[PDB]
Design an enzyme around this catalytic site. Structure first.
Site, PDB file in Angstrom:
ATOM      1  N   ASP A  74       0.865  -1.207   0.000  1.00  0.00           N
ATOM      2  CA  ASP A  74       0.000   0.000   0.000  1.00  0.00           C
ATOM      3  C   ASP A  74       0.891   1.242   0.000  1.00  0.00           C
ATOM      4  O   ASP A  74       0.517   2.198  -0.669  1.00  0.00           O
ATOM      5  CB  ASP A  74      -0.924   0.023   1.221  1.00  0.00           C
ATOM      6  CG  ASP A  74      -2.267  -0.647   1.004  1.00  0.00           C
ATOM      7  OD1 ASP A  74      -2.377  -1.521   0.108  1.00  0.00           O
ATOM      8  OD2 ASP A  74      -3.211  -0.244   1.705  1.00  0.00           O
TER       9      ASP A  74
ATOM     10  N   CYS B 201      -2.310   0.324 -13.376  1.00  0.00           N
ATOM     11  CA  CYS B 201      -2.354   0.360 -11.895  1.00  0.00           C
ATOM     12  C   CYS B 201      -3.621   1.210 -11.632  1.00  0.00           C
ATOM     13  O   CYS B 201      -4.624   1.030 -12.340  1.00  0.00           O
ATOM     14  CB  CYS B 201      -0.979   0.787 -11.380  1.00  0.00           C
ATOM     15  SG  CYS B 201      -0.357   2.322 -12.129  1.00  0.00           S
ATOM     16  N   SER B 202      -3.629   2.135 -10.673  1.00  0.00           N
ATOM     17  CA  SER B 202      -4.809   3.028 -10.529  1.00  0.00           C
ATOM     18  C   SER B 202      -4.753   4.148 -11.581  1.00  0.00           C
ATOM     19  O   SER B 202      -5.743   4.310 -12.340  1.00  0.00           O
ATOM     20  CB  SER B 202      -4.972   3.592  -9.137  1.00  0.00           C
ATOM     21  OG  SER B 202      -6.325   3.976  -8.937  1.00  0.00           O
ATOM     22  N   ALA B 203      -3.655   4.907 -11.626  1.00  0.00           N
ATOM     23  CA  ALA B 203      -3.541   6.052 -12.568  1.00  0.00           C
ATOM     24  C   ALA B 203      -2.947   5.600 -13.905  1.00  0.00           C
ATOM     25  O   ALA B 203      -3.138   6.289 -14.920  1.00  0.00           O
ATOM     26  CB  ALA B 203      -2.710   7.132 -11.926  1.00  0.00           C
ATOM     27  N   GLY B 204      -2.208   4.499 -13.922  1.00  0.00           N
ATOM     28  CA  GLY B 204      -1.500   4.092 -15.149  1.00  0.00           C
ATOM     29  C   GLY B 204      -0.180   4.820 -15.384  1.00  0.00           C
ATOM     30  O   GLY B 204       0.183   4.948 -16.563  1.00  0.00           O
ATOM     31  N   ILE B 205       0.530   5.273 -14.340  1.00  0.00           N
ATOM     32  CA  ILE B 205       1.793   6.053 -14.556  1.00  0.00           C
ATOM     33  C   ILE B 205       2.887   5.604 -13.592  1.00  0.00           C
ATOM     34  O   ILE B 205       4.035   5.669 -13.998  1.00  0.00           O
ATOM     35  CB  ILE B 205       1.530   7.578 -14.495  1.00  0.00           C
ATOM     36  CG1 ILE B 205       1.012   8.058 -13.136  1.00  0.00           C
ATOM     37  CG2 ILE B 205       0.593   8.006 -15.615  1.00  0.00           C
ATOM     38  CD1 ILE B 205       0.855   9.570 -13.015  1.00  0.00           C
ATOM     39  N   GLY B 206       2.558   5.195 -12.365  1.00  0.00           N
ATOM     40  CA  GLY B 206       3.549   4.876 -11.318  1.00  0.00           C
ATOM     41  C   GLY B 206       4.082   3.461 -11.436  1.00  0.00           C
ATOM     42  O   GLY B 206       5.126   3.237 -12.086  1.00  0.00           O
ATOM     43  N   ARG B 207       3.407   2.505 -10.810  1.00  0.00           N
ATOM     44  CA  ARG B 207       3.747   1.066 -10.915  1.00  0.00           C
ATOM     45  C   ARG B 207       3.809   0.638 -12.374  1.00  0.00           C
ATOM     46  O   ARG B 207       4.751  -0.109 -12.737  1.00  0.00           O
ATOM     47  CB  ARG B 207       2.695   0.271 -10.162  1.00  0.00           C
ATOM     48  CG  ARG B 207       2.809   0.502  -8.673  1.00  0.00           C
ATOM     49  CD  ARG B 207       1.673  -0.237  -8.025  1.00  0.00           C
ATOM     50  NE  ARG B 207       1.314   0.367  -6.785  1.00  0.00           N
ATOM     51  CZ  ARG B 207       0.311  -0.040  -5.993  1.00  0.00           C
ATOM     52  NH1 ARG B 207      -0.463  -1.043  -6.371  1.00  0.00           N
ATOM     53  NH2 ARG B 207       0.123   0.534  -4.805  1.00  0.00           N
ATOM     54  N   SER B 208       2.870   1.096 -13.190  1.00  0.00           N
ATOM     55  CA  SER B 208       2.810   0.771 -14.642  1.00  0.00           C
ATOM     56  C   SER B 208       4.071   1.234 -15.354  1.00  0.00           C
ATOM     57  O   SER B 208       4.639   0.512 -16.248  1.00  0.00           O
ATOM     58  CB  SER B 208       1.588   1.425 -15.267  1.00  0.00           C
ATOM     59  OG  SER B 208       0.366   0.841 -14.789  1.00  0.00           O
TER      60      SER B 208
ATOM     61  N   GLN C 185       6.284   7.871 -10.364  1.00  0.00           N
ATOM     62  CA  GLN C 185       5.575   8.924  -9.582  1.00  0.00           C
ATOM     63  C   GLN C 185       6.440   9.431  -8.418  1.00  0.00           C
ATOM     64  O   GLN C 185       6.166  10.535  -7.920  1.00  0.00           O
ATOM     65  CB  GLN C 185       4.256   8.384  -9.025  1.00  0.00           C
ATOM     66  CG  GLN C 185       3.084   8.565  -9.970  1.00  0.00           C
ATOM     67  CD  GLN C 185       1.776   8.140  -9.348  1.00  0.00           C
ATOM     68  OE1 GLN C 185       1.469   6.952  -9.247  1.00  0.00           O
ATOM     69  NE2 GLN C 185       0.979   9.114  -8.947  1.00  0.00           N
TER      70      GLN C 185
END
Ligand code: JN1
Length: 281
Positions: A180, A214-221, A261
């Site tokens: 998290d 992921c949620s936004a599509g920029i960090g983990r992705s 991010q």
């Protein structure tokens, strides 16, 4: 060599500084379609928009808009679609895009609930005998099989175009153990996961581009695509240490804003590429 550059930044604690230079050098292109009032209920986050030039268009005459970008890595010969976690009203659009782009795999890097909030709609079936029908886009989705492992789940799904009765098999790769807060301590399970996606054929040029979210599509992705492309370039190049992570990331940021991010995600990306290089040399 990036390993020495890693020690330098780490010993000097300069990660926030490197990260800020990347932020300042990153491309800024128009995202006019994202900001049209009719598209306000198609975006999960108001500050995360595809650029117009790289945005995926739905083949529906009404409204072609989805929050999704094509990232084209010319030297590595790899493409990815990065997208946000679908919303309740965009689950149909998501599967329409998968269908239209001939994708073989979907890579999910978040849980449906994190930090007590929903990060994503439940957009796939939980049981074989309860299939999902998306009436707006005329698609049926069936769970075929589910393999649950410690760090990830792989699902076989059947996507049916109710209009043509064509069917395709889609692989759903769900990394379930991203914490998290912050990043994993070791990149071992993440590399294992990336090698599993590769082994499936989902990233291969035979198929349309892999969908990653992921949620936004920029960090983990972002971390997923950056590690894959960097490792592929190390295989292809006469000199593997010519690969500059910071340059690759800036090239990827021409296609979608904000990839990676936090300074923590950047450090993690270096670690994943450094560790993955051992299993590739
Ligand atoms: O949690 C939500 C649900 N939607 C997606 C996003 N936030 C949003 C943002 C602005 C207006 C409307 C919406 S939504 O379509 O209700």
């Amino acid at each position: 060599e990036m390993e020495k550059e890693f020690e330098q930044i780490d010993k000097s604690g300069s990660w926030a500084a490197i990260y800020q230079d990347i932020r300042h050098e990153a491309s800024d292109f128009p995202s006019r379609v994202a900001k049209l009032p009719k598209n306000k209920n198609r975006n999960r986050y108001r500050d995360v928009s595809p650029f117009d030039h790289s945005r995926i268009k739905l083949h529906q005459e009404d409204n072609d808009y989805i929050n999704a970008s094509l990232i084209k890595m010319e030297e590595a010969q790899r493409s990815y679609i990065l997208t946000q976690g679908p919303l309740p009203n965009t689950v149909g659009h998501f599967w329409e895009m998968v269908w239209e782009q001939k994708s073989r795999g979907v890579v999910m890097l978040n849980r449906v609930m994190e930090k007590g909030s929903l990060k994503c709609a439940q957009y796939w079936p939980q049981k074989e005998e309860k299939e999902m029908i998306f009436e707006d886009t005329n698609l049926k989705l069936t769970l075929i099989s589910e393999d649950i492992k410690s760090y990830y789940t792989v699902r076989q799904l059947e996507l049916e175009n109710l209009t043509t009765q064509e069917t395709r098999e889609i692989l759903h790769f769900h990394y379930t153990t991203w914490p998290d807060f912050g990043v994993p301590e070791s990149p071992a399970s993440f590399l294992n996961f990336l090698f599993k996606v590769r082994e499936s054929g989902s990233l291969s040029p035979e198929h349309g581009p892999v969908v990653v979210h992921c949620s936004a599509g920029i960090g983990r992705s972002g971390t997923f695509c950056l590690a894959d492309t960097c490792l592929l370039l190390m295989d292809k190049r006469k000199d593997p240490s010519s690969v500059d992570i910071k340059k690759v990331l800036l090239e990827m940021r021409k296609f979608r804003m904000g990839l990676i991010q936090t300074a923590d995600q950047l450090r993690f990306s270096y670690l994943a590429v450094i560790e993955g290089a051992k299993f590739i040399m």
